Amino acid sequence: MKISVSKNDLENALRYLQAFLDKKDASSIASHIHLEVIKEKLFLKASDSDIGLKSYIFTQSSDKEGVGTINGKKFLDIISCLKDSNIILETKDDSLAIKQNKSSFKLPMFDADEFPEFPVIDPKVSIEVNAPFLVDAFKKIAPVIEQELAGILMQFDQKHQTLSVVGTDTKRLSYTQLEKISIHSTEEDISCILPKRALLEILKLFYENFSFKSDGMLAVIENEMHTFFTKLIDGNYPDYQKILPKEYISSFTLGKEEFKESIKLCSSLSSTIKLTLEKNNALFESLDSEHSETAKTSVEIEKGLDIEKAFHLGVNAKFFLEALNALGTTQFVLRCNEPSSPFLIQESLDEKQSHLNAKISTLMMPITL
Amino acid sequence: MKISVSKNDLENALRYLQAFLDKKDASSIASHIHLEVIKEKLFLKASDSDIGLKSYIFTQSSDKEGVGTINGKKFLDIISCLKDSNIILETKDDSLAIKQNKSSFKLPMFDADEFPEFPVIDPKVSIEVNAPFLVDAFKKIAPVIELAGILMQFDQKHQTLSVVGTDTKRLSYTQLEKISIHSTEEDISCILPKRALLEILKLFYENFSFKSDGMLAVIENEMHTFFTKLIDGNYPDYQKILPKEYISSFTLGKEEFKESIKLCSSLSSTIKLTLEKNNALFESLDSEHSETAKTSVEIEKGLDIEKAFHLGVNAKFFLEALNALGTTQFVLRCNEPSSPFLIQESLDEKLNAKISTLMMPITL
Ligand SMILES: O=C1Nc2ccc(Cl)cc2C1=O
């Protein structure tokens, strides 16, 4: 192998690969990046049986094609320290030479045959995502997922052209339903579970104009510059639809940002808050605070709510905050039944259709008293 | 007690006090700040045997004077979540109420009598510092740190304050001149602990005073008084270590040298410098088998060398010695490759401090 490349492109490509390397054992091939020059491109790839990324960059020149490997951290450490000029990369037997002008590096390669093979799939399901809504869905739901519940659910119904995205731990549950989606599939209904680990990586890599394919065991995401894959978590996600209350007794439209501030404020002294809703006021009190410690605040509700009898509700503070951080609206709807039954946080006008973005609703279990 | 205060002012004061609290045990007074309203001021104080800080802010209203205590962390957590509005602080039993419009809080106070008294000194030495040179010296020497502190040695005769830090493999020092030292002995030496040095960097820039009996340092500006205990006796004479003369002295590019070193130190802790008439060459030294990093830069202004001077140097030490300099060039003063060498500013013989560093080389 012998080529010259741009430093900015090489660097950028290297930063994204870092997260796919087991960097601690530098004597394992799991710490190395796989290189290959075909035609006027350098392909860079880091992977294991479980997750992977393949990228490419273009060459200024390409005297000689071939394969190689290199420690990912070192290679990035060296490249990030260089000037903004061409880097000559060039194999010397079992070593990779890097060169830029007066600077000269040699690094040992491993056997490129040991590098795990980058899988190809026969998709059962495939979509083209040409807007931010899916990654918007991932980003807003991720916080509820603890690393089958250890992942995000993507549920495809071809019949109805809907993709459902759902996360949960024991205590809360966020979902969204992306309607009007061009689902190409070999069944009418199929469910993939992406690990949290992969979810996070997807957020760093993709936004819109990518394809998502799966064969029911691996997912492969792809755009012009990248191909990423992950193993799926085998199993059955619980039926989320079963858990949702059928109807809600009460439905309150409230100030997102006033509620965040008042919650953050009480939660300075507690993990849980007592919410009191009245006609024209909301009251927040610290709940599980120590003997002798107390926080209280309130906000005016100018457009009166429909109650006579004042509604009280114990909530976990962080959950409630995170449910409000998943909404794009200035106001939110709180839907409840009994103070000890689950309640729901969702956007103002959540039934309305959105082009660019996902609308996440969160169902939460309250705290007693 | 009972008062109102500006939120920003209070927040600011609480932030500086955080470092003087043991926060892990909320049930100990060490997690608390001492409060006191006298006149139109609120005094806040966090201290122990070892170190302490006392601050004040002005009150917007006063009403009842007295004293109190409060958990510092919880106080800062509460305050930083309020509007910019004025805040009422009012005792109420053995509890402090905090109030801002619709928001109100209560926190338990402890007995203000268990709080250690803030010490006063009969000063053996004292100086007024109306320029940033001292803190500049402190920031520059801190990275290299009896020898667990920074030395301040006052020579009343010569009107000089020497600041010295070392870890046995390198030594950094400055001698600050033309300093109006007031003391009652001839040559006094205070050793400040690292913890104290760090806190000082956060509090003081210029227009403060520094005073010490031979046991505590107290430092004081318009908003604050800080103290720390000194480290007890016998800082080695750094002057004993300095070479008398140096064989070679080379003026060299600081930034070219940093880059070339960072770059080589990607594969090792140590580097082989080679100097020639018109080039400097850098090579990773203790890199693992078959890893290699070389680079070089041109020296347009020829160095006085017949044949190549080789010197093994510790990459991070050499970097921090260059980071401690304020000039675009630096001077490297050398004897034999096996004996210590000196890094200092170009035009070091002369607002700021100029720190020189002496380092032990690496063999082969
Ligand atoms: O997120 C949730 N997980 C649950 C499991 C059982 C019941 Cl009854 C409610 C919930 C939630 O809100």
Numbering used by the authors:
A (entry chain B): 1 to 147, 153 to 374
B (entry chain A): 1 to 145, 153 to 357, 361 to 374
Task: Quote the original article.
Among them one such target is β-clamp. β-clamp, a part of DNA pol III holoenzyme is very crucial protein as it is involved in myriads of steps during DNA replication. It is the key protein that increases the processivity of many important enzymes and complexes by interacting with them. β-clamp prevents the polymerase from dissociating, while polymerase’s rapid movement along the DNA molecule. Biological active form of β-clamp is dimer and each monomeric unit consists of three domains, where the protein-binding site resides in between domain II and III. This interaction site is divided into two subsites and all β-clamp interacting partners bind to these subsites.
All of these crystals yielded clear electron density for the ligand molecules with good occupancy, except for 5-chloroisatin. The occupancy of 5-chloroisatin was quite low. Moreover, based on data obtained from the soaked crystals, the temperature factor of this inhibitor was high when compared to the average temperature factor of the protein. Thr175 of Hpβ-clamp was also observed to make a hydrogen bond with the inhibitor 5-chloroisatin. In case of 5-chloroisatin, the Thr175 of Hpβ-clamp makes hydrogen bond with ligand however that in Ecβ-clamp is made by Thr172 in the neighborhood. Out of various hydrophobic contacts between the β-clamp and inhibitor, three of them are common in both H. pylori and E. coli β-clamp. These residues include Ile248, Lys176, Arg177 in Hpβ-clamp, and Val247, His175, Arg176 in Ecβ-clamp. The orientation of the 5-chloroisatin inhibitor in the docked structure did differ from that in the crystal structure, but this difference did not affect much the structure of the binding site. With an MIC of 18 µM drug C1 (5-chloroisatin) showed significant antimicrobial activity. The drug C1 (5-chloroisatin) showed extra H-bond with Thr173 compared to other complex structures may be responsible for better binding and thus better inhibition.
